[PDB]
Amino acid sequence: KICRRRSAGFKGPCMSNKNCAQVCQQEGWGGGNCDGPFRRCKCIRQC
């Protein structure tokens, strides 16, 4: 199981994968990518 949920904390344009991933590592996720036109931060974990 791949948990691909959106960052509840990261309000607005994530702009880069790295920025998204950093907040997600804080917020209990193994990584994350910055989705679409780089607003939504959607983060990876193994469930």
UniProtKB/Swiss-Prot annotation:
SMART domains from the UniProt entry: Knot1 (SM00505)
Site (Interaction with trypsin): 11
Disulfide bridges in this chain: 3-47, 14-34, 20-41, 24-43
Protein's UniProt keywords contain Disulfide bond: yes
Annotated GO biological process: defense response; defense response to fungus; killing of cells of another organism
Domain of life: Eukaryota
Keyword Disulfide bond among record annotations: yes
InterPro entries with a match to the protein in the record: Defensin_plant, Scorpion_toxin-like, Scorpion_toxin-like_sf
Keywords: Antimicrobial, Disulfide bond, Fungicide, Plant defense
Pfam families, A to Z: Gamma-thionin
Function text: Inhibits protein translation in cell-free systems.
Similarity-based family: Belongs to the DEFL family.
Listed name of the protein: Defensin-like protein 1
Organism: Triticum aestivum
